[PDB]
Amino acid sequence: LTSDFDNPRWIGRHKHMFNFLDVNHNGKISLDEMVYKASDIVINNLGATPEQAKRHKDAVEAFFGGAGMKYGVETDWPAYIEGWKKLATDELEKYAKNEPTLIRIWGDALFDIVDKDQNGAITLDEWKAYTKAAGIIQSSEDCEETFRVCDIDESGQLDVDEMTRQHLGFWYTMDPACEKLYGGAVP
Numbered sequence: 001l002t003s004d005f006d007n008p009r010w011i012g013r014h015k016h017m018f019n020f021l022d023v024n025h026n027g028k029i030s031l032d033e034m035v036y037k038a039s040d041i042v043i044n045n046l047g048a049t050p051e052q053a054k055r056h057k058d059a060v061e062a063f064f065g066g067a068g069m070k071y072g073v074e075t076d077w078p079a080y081i082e083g084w085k086k087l088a089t090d091e092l093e094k095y096a097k098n099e100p101t102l103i104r105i106w107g108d109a110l111f112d113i114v115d116k117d118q119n120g121a122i123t124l125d126e127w128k129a130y131t132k133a134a135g136i137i138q139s140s141e142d143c144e145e146t147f148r149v150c151d152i153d154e155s156g157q158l159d160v161d162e163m164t165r166q167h168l169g170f171w172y173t174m175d176p177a178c179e180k181l182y183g184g185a186v187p
């Protein structure tokens with residue numbers, strides 16, 4: 001439940017993602033681009049209903065919002081990483097107080113789209129469909145590493161509650177137990 005913001009591997013994890021989000025190498029990204037990307041994936045690749053898409057958009061907006069990003073503002077790397085320090089701090093504070101995190105809220109919205117059974121858990125094939133559409137993982141072998149790192153349930157599925165815990169460790173705290181969550185795709 002403690003952050004590790006001076007760790008070069010934390011900083012570099014998020015710089016990897018900044019660079020991945022900055023698809024046209026502008027050195028800056030906007031909230032507009034984030035919510036476009038989000039809705040493009042779920043509506044155009046993953047079959048989301050209109051209601052599901054709007055729920056998902058609201059969650060992504062709130063997530064990057066928590067990192068300081070705003071509509072009509074171009075966020076460069078120094079502003080992006082400083083805002084990520086605020087997001088991670090807020091998220092860990094919520095998690096410690098048993099309050100829903102922004103990453104959980106996003107997960108619930110995403111999993112309602114990706115889980116054909118709408119019961120809060122995804123198969124490996126579903127995780128492959130999501131991460132390859134998003135681009136955050138490219139290869140099947142890296143998607144398969146997720147399922148090695150995560151505690152998989154009795155039906156072979158990845159529950160949103162488990163992925164949220166792994167995400168806290170991976171994106172917010174540098175928990176060694178959560179290394180390689182995205183395989184080699186994200187250092």
Ligand SMILES: O=C1N2C=C(c3ccc(O)cc3)N[C@@H](Cc3ccccc3)C2=N[C@@]1(Cc1ccc(Br)cc1)OO
Nearest residue numbers: 014017018034037038103104106107134136160163164
């Ligand atoms: O955890 C997830 N992330 C985390 C990030 C991320 C990016 C930058 C950064 O500095 C830190 C994290 N990005 C994405 C991909 C994406 C970005 C923007 C719009 C749509 C999709 C992502 N997709 C998710 C979706 C998700 C969310 C919550 C839960 Br629980 C499970 C899955 O899984 O790969």
